[PDB]
Design a protein around this ligand. Structure first.
Ligand SMILES: [Mg+2]
Ligand SMILES: [Mg+2]
Ligand SMILES: [Mg+2]
Ligand SMILES: [Mg+2]
Lengths: 107, 97, 51, 109, 250, 51
């Protein structure tokens, strides 16, 4: 709902359009586990695409915990420090690739 | 409120004990035990069901005919009212007629 | 609040390297680390070293 | 009584293995009478046992229970051994890979 | 010396048998001593995970018998009278107490005494469930075969280190033909521990070998269930239960 | 009009016939889909786990 939810005027972070463009995604912190059937999407995503994702984006930094977790998580913070966590529980590798891609795209 | 503020204690789940380790054993005594016995006499349970399926009516009529003479008066009285209410129910009430 | 170094999932050398690639700059880490390091932290570093 | 150190499942084929196994094939079969020895068959279990038994204890790689029934002729055994096999955790091989500086992976055990 | 078993039953012309290694427990380092060809139709059946689903959960279900029960409004004590007049007061119409609405009243649709989920599958399906069970073990290299379950030391320490030295797994089964010919050494080991369980050949089932991460047989046992399941494959039409005698079948 | 009744009598009967036969082939082509060992055993891969 518009009235129940806050609002804002449209604005970019420090006018990233005129000057050199900078990928405004700072960090990605994956939380996977050596066990748990739900982590098949994240682990296979770590095998194939996270490598190429780093080669494509040298600016962004990536961390992987690989600890016991009943549900895998992925945490993403930006230059402004705005933390945004999303659940990748029981998701395909294709969905996770599009999910991490739009996270890299957004500010 | 229905929820509980504090968590419950973590119930330890022993996946390796006498029952669960020896679970499922001696079910194929007929298939590779030269058919000396059937797997239906293996199960421990009431005498009105040892290798047999039935609905609410079927299990009740089998009960009173077999062990009803040994049942209590109150339990036998509730049994007769049960089948009488369920006899008319399945016969008169419901769809498909 | 605290420093991000105090918070988990942090590697110092990898962050300045990944940071340098973010704003499209590439040069020696000796010049980078000398810029980020301040004189005040050296006072606390040697202070904690003695104590 | 005493447990010696475990054998690593990892195994790589040394050079001139074809000459090594071929020297033993001639030891089992006086001599290899027919030419084109690659198509020789192992219908008998004694021939297959003495063949595979010497290969394992000499090299250090055992054929599984799922594949020896597929190893009908000797060239199949040649293809099963010339291909390598490895044994290291995913953390070990990923760290061994040339990961860029920005990427890091941990191991909380 | 090697110990070879050649199949006594007939095999199809278009399916060759499958060889398998043989081991023992006299020594520690002793591995790959003897071979044994195996019938393909029972050791190379299709995966058929749906078959394993039915037969495995079947023996989870037919042995189950419930004991839950709820007293109905007739069974709960009281509730014979009418508490108040139909139009006398503002209170809602209620014929008695102990209805499903009132506190402490009986359930309308709840559990009814000890129920029975007993249902028997076809013998061919249950047999084929056993055929495919040890088959996938052979594909995954999960089972093992050996001459006999004798060992000189006879303790859990030697048994445990022997397992993960050959890299079998965490949980294992041990199979023998009858209940009497098990050596006292191996059985005293399995009694102290829990994981490396032991069962006879008659009690062999899919759920235990699928729960346990590996399997173990003996050559007399391999010929035993082979004769049974192939006899189920070439079986004659059952006119009556097999408990009664036959001409050739005991 | 462009054409007469008896002019346009039997000019499009070919298309209406072959078009209806295509509907017949579409109706007869009705069966369950094909099953595979691939899509059956991919469910086993849920327990794929690292060494
Ligand atoms: Mg009453
Ligand atoms: Mg009354
Ligand atoms: Mg009334
Ligand atoms: Mg009650």
């Amino acid at each position: 709902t518009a009235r129940g939810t806050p609002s804002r005027f449209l604005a970019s972070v420090l006018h990233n359009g005129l000057g050199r463009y900078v990928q405004q995604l700072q960090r990605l912190s994956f939380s996977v586990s050596r066990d748990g059937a739900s982590s098949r999407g994240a682990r296979e995503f770590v095998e194939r695409e996270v490598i190429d994702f780093a080669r494509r984006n040298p600016g962004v930094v990536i961390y992987v915990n690989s600890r016991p977790c009943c549900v895998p998580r992925v945490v993403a913070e930006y230059l402004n420090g705005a933390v945004r966590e999303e659940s990748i529980h029981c998701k395909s590798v294709e969905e996770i690739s599009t999910l991490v891609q739009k996270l890299a795209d957004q500010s | 409120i229905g929820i509980r503020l504090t968590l419950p204690p973590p119930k330890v789940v022993d996946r390796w004990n006498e029952k669960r380790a020896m679970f499922g054993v001696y079910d194929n005594i007929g298939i590779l035990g030269n058919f000396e016995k059937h797997p239906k006499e293996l199960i421990r349970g009431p005498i009105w069901l040892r290798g047999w399926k039935g609905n609410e009516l079927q299990r009740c009529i089998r009960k009173r005919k077999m062990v009803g003479s040994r049942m209590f008066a109150d339990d036998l009285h509730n049994l007769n009212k049960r089948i009488r209410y369920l006899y008319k129910h399945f016969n008169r009430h419901g769809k498909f007629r | 609040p605290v420093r991000r170094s105090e918070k988990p999932n942090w590697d110092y050398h990898a962050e300045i390297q990944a940071f340098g690639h973010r704003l499209q700059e590439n040069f020696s880490l000796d010049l980078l680390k000398t810029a980020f390091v301040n004189s005040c932290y050296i006072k606390s570093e040697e202070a904690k070293r003695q104590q | 009584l005493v447990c010696p150190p475990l054998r690593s499942r990892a195994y790589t084929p040394p050079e001139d293995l074809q000459s090594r196994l071929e020297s033993y094939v001639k030891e089992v079969f006086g001599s290899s009478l027919p030419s084109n020895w690659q198509d020789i068959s192992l219908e008998d279990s004694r021939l297959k046992f003495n063949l595979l038994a010497h290969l394992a204890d000499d090299l250090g790689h055992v054929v599984p229970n799922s594949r020896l029934h597929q190893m009908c002729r000797v060239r199949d055994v040649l293809d099963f051994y010339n291909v390598p096999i490895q044994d290291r955790s995913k953390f070990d091989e990923l760290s061994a890979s040339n990961l860029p500086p920005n990427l890091k992976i941990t191991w909380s055990y | 010396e090697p110990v070879l078993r050649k199949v006594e039953l007939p095999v199809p012309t278009h399916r060759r048998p499958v060889q398998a290694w043989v081991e023992s427990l006299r020594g520690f380092e002793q591995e790959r001593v003897g071979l044994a060809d195996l019938h393909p139709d029972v050791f190379a059946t299709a995966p058929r995970l749906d078959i394993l689903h039915q037969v495995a959960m079947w023996q989870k279900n037919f042995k189950r018998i419930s004991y839950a029960k709820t007293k109905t409004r007739a069974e709960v004590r009281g509730g014979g009278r009418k508490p108040w007049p139909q139009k006398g007061t503002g209170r809602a119409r209620h014929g008695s107490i102990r209805s499903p609405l009132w506190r402490g009243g009986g359930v309308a649709h709840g559990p009814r005494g000890p129920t029975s989920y007993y249902y028997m599958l076809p013998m061919k399906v249950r047999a084929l469930g056993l055929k495919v069970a040890l088959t996938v073990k052979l594909a995954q290299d999960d089972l093992h075969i050996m001459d006999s379950l004798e060992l000189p030391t006879g303790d859990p320490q030697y048994l445990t280190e022997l397992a993960h030295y050959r890299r079998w797994g965490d949980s294992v089964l041990l199979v023998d033909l009858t209940h009497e010919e098990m050596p006292q050494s191996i059985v005293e080991a399995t009694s102290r521990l829990k994981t490396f369980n032991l069962i006879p050949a008659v009690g062999l089932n899919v759920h235990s070998m699928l729960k346990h991460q590996t399997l173990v047989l003996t050559l007399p046992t391999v010929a035993f269930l082979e004769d049974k399941l192939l006899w189920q494959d070439s079986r004659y039409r059952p006119l009556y239960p097999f408990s009664l005698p036959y001409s050739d079948f005991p | 009009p462009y054409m007469t009744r008896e002019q346009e009598r039997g000019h499009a009967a070919v298309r209406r016939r072959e078009a209806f036969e295509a509907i017949k082939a579409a109706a007869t082509s009705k069966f369950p889909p094909h099953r595979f060992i691939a899509d059956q055993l991919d469910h086993l891969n849920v327990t794929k786990k690292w060494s």
